[PDB]
Scaffold this motif. Structure first.
Motif, mmCIF file in Angstrom:
data_model
loop_
_atom_site.group_PDB
_atom_site.id
_atom_site.type_symbol
_atom_site.label_atom_id
_atom_site.label_comp_id
_atom_site.label_asym_id
_atom_site.label_seq_id
_atom_site.Cartn_x
_atom_site.Cartn_y
_atom_site.Cartn_z
ATOM 1 N N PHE I 69 -2.340 -22.278 -2.449
ATOM 2 C CA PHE I 69 -2.577 -22.019 -1.035
ATOM 3 C C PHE I 69 -3.847 -21.227 -0.770
ATOM 4 O O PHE I 69 -4.371 -21.289 0.345
ATOM 5 C CB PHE I 69 -1.390 -21.272 -0.422
ATOM 6 N N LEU I 70 -4.348 -20.484 -1.755
ATOM 7 C CA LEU I 70 -5.642 -19.837 -1.586
ATOM 8 C C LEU I 70 -6.764 -20.863 -1.557
ATOM 9 O O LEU I 70 -7.782 -20.648 -0.892
ATOM 10 C CB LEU I 70 -5.866 -18.818 -2.702
ATOM 11 N N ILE I 71 -6.596 -21.977 -2.265
ATOM 12 C CA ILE I 71 -7.600 -23.034 -2.256
ATOM 13 C C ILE I 71 -7.408 -23.946 -1.054
ATOM 14 O O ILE I 71 -8.338 -24.189 -0.278
ATOM 15 C CB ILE I 71 -7.547 -23.834 -3.570
ATOM 16 N N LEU I 72 -6.187 -24.457 -0.885
ATOM 17 C CA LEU I 72 -5.927 -25.492 0.110
ATOM 18 C C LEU I 72 -6.267 -25.038 1.524
ATOM 19 O O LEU I 72 -6.725 -25.847 2.336
ATOM 20 C CB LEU I 72 -4.463 -25.920 0.025
ATOM 21 N N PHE I 73 -6.059 -23.761 1.840
ATOM 22 C CA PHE I 73 -6.218 -23.283 3.209
ATOM 23 C C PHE I 73 -7.315 -22.244 3.363
ATOM 24 O O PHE I 73 -8.179 -22.394 4.234
ATOM 25 C CB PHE I 73 -4.886 -22.721 3.724
ATOM 26 N N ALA I 74 -7.314 -21.193 2.548
ATOM 27 C CA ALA I 74 -8.253 -20.092 2.705
ATOM 28 C C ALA I 74 -9.464 -20.205 1.788
ATOM 29 O O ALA I 74 -9.978 -19.176 1.337
ATOM 30 C CB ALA I 74 -7.545 -18.757 2.467
ATOM 31 N N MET I 75 -9.919 -21.423 1.501
ATOM 32 C CA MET I 75 -11.079 -21.653 0.640
ATOM 33 C C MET I 75 -10.887 -21.045 -0.748
ATOM 34 O O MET I 75 -11.829 -20.523 -1.344
ATOM 35 C CB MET I 75 -12.351 -21.091 1.283
#
Ligand SMILES: COc1nc2ccc(Br)cc2cc1[C@@H](c1ccccc1)[C@@](O)(CCN(C)C)c1cccc2ccccc12
Lengths: 223, 105, 41, 74, 44, 77, 45, 38, 75, 75, 75, 75, 75, 75, 75, 75
Positions: I69-75
């Motif tokens: 979720f750090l990649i998918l949404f918050a870059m």
């Protein structure tokens, strides 16, 4: 739109996130009497059973934290449980709050292992029956893991309440979509949401006991 | 001072009985009830309470709550009493003994 | 503003001074992290 | 006290000090605590009525977000 | 507990506003039904 | 079941025409309260009660609103 | 920890029933001879 | 991720410290277990 | 966009790490079955270890959902 | 085109995380065979732990199908 | 067409989830050989837990073959 | 063409499912050694379990090779 | 353009090595349960090893999470 | 040339199935130590099972390296 | 560039080998609990086998981290 | 180019095979501690298997570090 339940709540321009963090202590009344009501009789029993659990394993200096490590399992187990209510903003899904409960209790635990008893704290990095010829590798582990324990706590709790709410909120949206479709399927997706809510109730308490046990185990290794 | 022995006689654990008696005279028995259905059907019609994913996470955590109360209530209801009528008896007992240690003396 | 000493600090006196003394040394570390994180943002 | 008064002056009669409205909560708390919680043989409804008034507050600030998910437009 | 006689103006006032509703529910239903379909058509 | 029906048969029923005269009588009561100001006579105890029963009867207009369109959640189109 | 040990019994009481069971399943040619070579006569004061 | 919006961090840090360290503990110091009598 | 497309590959690859913690909860709740059939008088103290083993293994799976979720949404 | 394509590479690579729930359910029902052959009087107490250890495996198996869903549909 | 090319790596990577149901059927029938050596009197009742534990682990394996046969054939 | 390039990564990823049937055969023929060293009088029955357990383990492992040889050649 | 897209895939792969610590911490606390039920008078000394094992298996998983970020953020 | 470059991925990813065998050989020769430390007078027949297990798992570890050499050179 | 790009997926996927040394240190320090709960009078000789198994399993973890830091900065 | 790029992704995804040579070396030395604490009279003969198992599971790990240094340096 999906992470909406994690944005800082504000009503009428007021930061309502303070009346939500200060509320858990309002559910713990106290009394000087000797024989009170059912609430304080059950609560004063839980605090007795809890304190006898985390604190029995400590020595006399570690037991001076018996107010902190009990008033912490009571604040995390009540913040999580007040998050399972509908639409509720649980402030334990916040990496800010969780990093503020994790760093002080950790830093204040290794400091007393470095400001005093330091020569003994120097012996946990090297286990007892350790041969020498590969020590210059083990020194990295016991330090770099020590330097990341405060971030293990705050993220073990953030990523477990966040992901627990995200799942219940998605499976919830599933039952809403299959509501206008074959309904005997809605009742099987719903009964998954019920078994998932009984799980998120248990993980609401377990994530409070594990947080305050790993802060205890750090303390036990420094007193 | 001694505590009372009963609370507020709340119906459905949400609305206290001071409300039903307050509206009973002018509107009758089914007075407050039809207000409930009157507000709920108005709320979710004008999209005041908008049905969302949280609706089905509400009913679940309300279903588990209303079932944990009905199944584990009476057990905790008396267990909180037995902790008292034990701590009470544990005192009255030693209290009498503490006389023997002063009556015999 | 009395009983802020008696009810609010007299109880917490043996803790805020002796037992949680190293907590505050850590709470300063935390405040340095929070401002730094907000400084690079 | 209100529930027996009739005048709009009562709104201004009250003690609206930083210590004033606090004593109206601390007295509004002990009037509730003593009624439903602080009795032997009390029931769970002393709590399940606080949470019910804690959801309505947790929903009131969360309405600015749920409004973007209405399934109608009128 | 025996039922209670409700005040008269409230007793018909239910059906007073009731038929006022089903009427108001008929008008705006037939007033919004045409307006909507072109907004759905012109959205294409 | 039958209990909800046992109570409905008295007040959840269409009114009698004989109550219309005394109904507008009370209608004239509260309007004279609007002329000279007998609303000032109202203590808050029953003041809110008259308000809730007003919201009580008002919802009848909305449950009738939804039956005039055969739809629950807003307007179907 | 078996169920009888939770039920208060001891292995002596466990063995007295298992051995009684074997004899109770012996055939009449041997059941009479085997019961008296292992019967009990001692008594407690 | 709205947890990363660092503009509302001091709104979560200070009312926590005012609860975990002063209000919840104060209510624990009021929970005392007296030793049993003879 | 190749930058927004590469998010779905990393996010989908990051969440494979939940296979680990999904296999360590079967060891714990499998060992509880074994360790409880040998000393059923310790039922409460064993379960107090199945809990600590559950939460400390499962935690390592969510550290992969964090990067999922750090990649998918918050870059 | 690449954005809608990079999802099947990310979705399929995300439903791998349920492999760990295929081994966690083995070790659970594999220890119910070992724990029951040891104490066959607790057949109903152990089986209720296997159902608990089995259910908690779907829990970590669902955390993957969530990220396999978000990548696929709610990008 | 980078569309159907990504539907190949999808099914190709979504079927790695079977590596769990291969190492779960190994621990069910592995721990049946161990549990049956100890108490061979319960041969029948143990084998009724293997079939129950083999299927519940293989189910979580076919769900990957069912997903790999969706990204490849359905959509 | 890219499909010919995607069928290679699709197959070279499906064969990773065999890593399950390689650790699941070591747990079946590893639990025959532990199960036979205890009760070596059942060698002719513990074995006939380590063949059922070995066939039901390579089966879920040869699916991932059948899938590979179904993506790589046969559509 | 692609130099950043590759930092979302290289970081999504580095973080799956945590799955090796979700299964390690399960084996450590799946042995603190078995080993305890056999010798419950050594609870103080078994727990002192389950922590040493939980810290040394987690220390390997967090190396992956550090290379996940040291690629995603540093270089 | 995107296909010749793809063969280096499908052949480098198929060879990770070997990590299954290498883990099912440590189970076999770790069960030969637990089964020989109990009944050492069976050293002959145990070792003829720790070879049937070693040569049946390490065959699955060769089916992966067989496809790794089928994509890298045979295409 | 495509070299500086792929050298991040390489060095980002090479470091999954640490997933081995995650569950190898969990078994060594997991079975040390079971080896000590049985023969606690060997605590000095057991713990010297755990440190040997912890240093030989982790050394296989370093060999992977060594490669990821070889195809990144060395060349 | 496209090849010298993919050569780093193939050599990276191949050295993940060591993750099975780290869970084997763990299980071998995990049974040397269990097997030697049960029958310490066999210290020299149990250790003579934990060297064979160490070398035979680590031989499948070399097979992956070899096929990595084949795409990376040879071709
Ligand atoms: C029956 O299976 C279950 N048992 C559970 C046991 C405990 C818990 Br707490 C959760 C459980 C959840 C489920 C399923 C379920 C059914 C319906 C809705 C949601 C979830 C499941 O999640 C399977 C989980 N595995 C495979 C990862 C699933 C998800 C998605 C698509 C499916 C399609 C087909 C079959 C199952 C599908």
């Amino acid at each position: 739109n999906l992470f909406a339940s994690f944005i800082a709540p504000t009503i009428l321009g007021l930061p309502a996130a303070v009346l939500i963090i200060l509320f858990p202590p309002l559910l713990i009344p106290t009394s000087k009497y000797l024989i009170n009501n059912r609430l304080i009789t059950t609560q004063q029993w839980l605090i007795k059973l809890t304190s006898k659990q985390m604190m029995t394993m400590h020595n006399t200096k570690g037991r001076t934290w018996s107010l902190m490590l009990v008033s912490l399992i009571i604040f995390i187990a009540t913040t999580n449980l007040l998050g399972l209510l509908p639409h509720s903003f649980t402030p334990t899904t916040q990496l800010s709050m969780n990093l503020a409960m994790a760093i002080p209790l950790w830093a204040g635990t290794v400091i007393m292992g470095f400001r005093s008893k330091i020569k003994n704290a120097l012996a946990h990095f090297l286990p007892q029956g350790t041969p020498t010829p590969l020590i210059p590798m083990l020194v990295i582990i016991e330090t770099i893991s020590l330097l990341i324990q405060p971030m293990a706590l705050a993220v073990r709790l953030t990523a477990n309440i966040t992901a627990g709410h995200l799942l219940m909120h998605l499976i919830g949206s599933a039952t809403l979509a299959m509501s206008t479709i074959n309904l005997p399927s809605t009742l099987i997706i719903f009964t998954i949401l019920i078994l998932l809510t009984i799980l998120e109730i248990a993980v609401a308490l377990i994530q409070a006991y594990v947080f305050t046990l790993l802060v205890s185990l750090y303390l036990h290794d420094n007193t | 001072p001694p505590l009372p022995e009963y609370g507020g006689k709340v119906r459905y654990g949400l609305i206290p009985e001071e409300f039903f008696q307050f509206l009973y005279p002018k509107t009758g028995v089914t007075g407050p009830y039809v207000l409930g259905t009157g507000l709920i059907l108005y709320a979710l019609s004008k999209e005041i309470y908008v049905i969302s994913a949280e609706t089905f996470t509400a009913l679940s955590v309300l279903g588990v709550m209303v079932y944990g109360i009905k199944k584990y209530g009476p057990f905790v209801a008396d267990f909180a009493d037995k902790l008292n009528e034990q701590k009470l008896a544990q005192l009255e007992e030693a209290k009498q003994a503490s006389i023997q240690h002063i009556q015999n003396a | 503003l009395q009983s802020i000493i008696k009810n609010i600090w007299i109880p917490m006196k043996p803790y805020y001074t002796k037992v949680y003394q190293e907590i505050w040394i850590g709470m300063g570390l935390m405040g340095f992290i929070v401002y730094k994180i907000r400084a690079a943002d | 006290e209100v529930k027996l008064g009739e005048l709009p002056s009562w709104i201004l009669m009250r003690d609206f000090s930083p210590s004033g409205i606090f004593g109206a909560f601390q007295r509004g708390y002990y009037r509730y605590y003593n009624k439903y919680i602080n009795v032997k043989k009390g029931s769970i409804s002393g709590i399940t009525m606080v949470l019910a008034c804690y959801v309505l507050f947790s929903y009131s600030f969360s309405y600015k977000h749920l409004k973007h998910e209405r399934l109608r437009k009128y | 507990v025996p039922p209670v006689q409700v005040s008269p103006l409230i007793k018909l006032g239910r059906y007073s506003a009731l038929f006022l509703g089903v009427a108001y529910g008929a008008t705006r239903y037939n007033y919004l039904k045409p307006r909507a379909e072109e907004e759905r058509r012109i959205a294409a | 079941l039958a209990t909800f029906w046992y109570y409905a048969k008295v007040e959840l029923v269409p009114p009698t025409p004989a109550e219309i005269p005394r109904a507008i009588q009370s209608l004239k009561k509260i309007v004279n309260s609007a002329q000279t100001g007998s609303f000032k006579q109202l203590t808050v105890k029953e003041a809110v009660l008259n308000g809730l029963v007003a919201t009580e009867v008002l919802m009848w207009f909305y449950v009738g609103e939804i039956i005039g369109k055969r739809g629950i959640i807003g307007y179907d189109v | 920890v078996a169920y009888w040990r939770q039920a208060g019994l001891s292995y002596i009481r466990y063995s007295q029933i298992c051995a009684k069971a074997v004899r109770d399943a012996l055939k009449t040619e041997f059941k009479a001879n085997a019961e008296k070579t292992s019967g009990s006569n001692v008594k407690i004061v | 991720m709205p947890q990363l919006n660092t503009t509302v961090w001091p709104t979560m840090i200070t009312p926590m410290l005012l609860t975990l360290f002063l209000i919840t503990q104060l209510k624990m110091l009021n929970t005392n277990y007296h030793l049993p009598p003879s | 966009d190749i930058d927004t497309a590469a998010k779905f590959i990393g996010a989908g690859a990051a969440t494979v790490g939940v296979a680990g913690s999904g296999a360590g909860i079967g060891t714990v709740f499998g060992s509880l079955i074994i360790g409880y059939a040998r000393n059923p008088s310790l039922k409460q103290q064993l379960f107090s270890y199945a809990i600590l083993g559950f939460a400390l293994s499962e935690a390592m799976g969510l550290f992969c959902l964090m990067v999922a979720f750090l990649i998918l949404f918050a870059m």
